[PDB]
């Protein structure tokens with residue numbers, strides 16, 4: 670029964686998931702001045718041409734758009750990664766106000782929202798096996814600032830009215846995730862974990878330096894979703910983000926100067 674409230678929020682997670690106080694926990698504050706520029710980092714290979722979405726689902730914490738990951742259709746290569754990573758699903762973390770919502774911060778700067786494209790390493794067979802390996806997952810974090818509208822996001826926004834409550838799902842085919850990327854693929858990378866329970870420490874994080882712009886009307890329909898299920902008292906799905914965690918014995922690396 671974890672959530673983002675007062676009595677089950679991220680401050681209560683360690684009592685049911687003691688790994689929450691682990692070494693490689695996410696998110697963290699990306700200090701751009703201590704981030705070490707690594708010239709040995711290859712450019713990110715974002716191959717989303719043959720991406721095949723299936724369904725968008727409200728799971729009571731966010732909304733996931735699920736992709737067909739039984740083949741190499743939308744993969745992420747290069748960068749700090751060794752091998753191939755299949756795109757399985759993506760989700761957003763947003764806040765009740767435009768000055769908060771992102772899980773990662775850039776010099777303590779909180780963005781309005783953060784997009785998380787979750788991938789799993791193909792050399793482990795499926796997602797359930799990849800989460801149990803330190804190099805099993807790779808999430809492509811992308812910040813969202815409130816400005817001009819993002820066209821490629823409009824299909825996701827218009828379908829949120831059909832998945833208002835927890836447990837609701839709807840067909841979501843032929844969505845291109847390439848429309849959610851910024852112009853530049855400069856990134857920071859560091860070893861981390863899932864930012865939600867079970868908080869498994871298995872994620873290679875890739876956080877793009879450049880954010881994407883979305884309109885206030887686009888993010889205002891994120892905030893119309895509900896944590897609760899149908900027929901229950903309404904609790905708006907806002908502030909579904911985990912605050913930063915101690916970096917501890919970790920060095921964040923950059924692909925740019």
Ligand SMILES: [Zn+2]
Pocket residue numbers: 760761762785864
């Ligand atoms: Zn996430």
